[PDB]
Amino acid sequence: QKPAACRCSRQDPKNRVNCGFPGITSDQCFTSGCCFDSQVPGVPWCFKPLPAQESEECVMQVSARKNCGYPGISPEDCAARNCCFSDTIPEVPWCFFPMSVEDCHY
């Protein structure tokens, strides 16, 4: 299934992880759960989407996270402060500010 827009557009083209086989079409790429973009040269055209989050406002590259909490903040407290919580990647804030989706596109 085609991934939500932010899982595709919020990635730096140079950080793209290739998805599918050589020559996979735009439709096949989307159908496979990947993102397709034929506009940037020299980078994968069919690529893996960013991990899905609780909401699409919480989708962004790990390096774009703005710390909305503190060391040891709980998921619930983070949710109270109106933020996104994700503790699966090292060195990055686990509680972070979400970003409205107007920038997202295919």
Q: Which two tokens stand for residue 64?
A: 């774009």
- Contact by Cβ (8 Å): 50, 11: yes
Q: Residue 30: CB partners within 8 Å, gap ≥ 6?
A: 2, 3, 36
Please give the resolution of this entry in Å, rounded to 1 decimal. Answer: 2.0
- Contact by Cβ (8 Å): 64, 10: yes
- Domains annotated on the chain, with CATH: 2-59+100-106 (4.10.110.10), 60-99 (4.10.110.10)
Please, which experimental method was used?
Answer: X-ray
Q: What is the DSSP string of the chain?
A: -PPPTHHHHTS-GGG--B-S-TT--HHHHHHTT-EE--SSTTS-SEEPPPPP-SSGGG---GGG--B-S-TT--HHHHHHTT-EE--SSTTS-SEE----GGG---
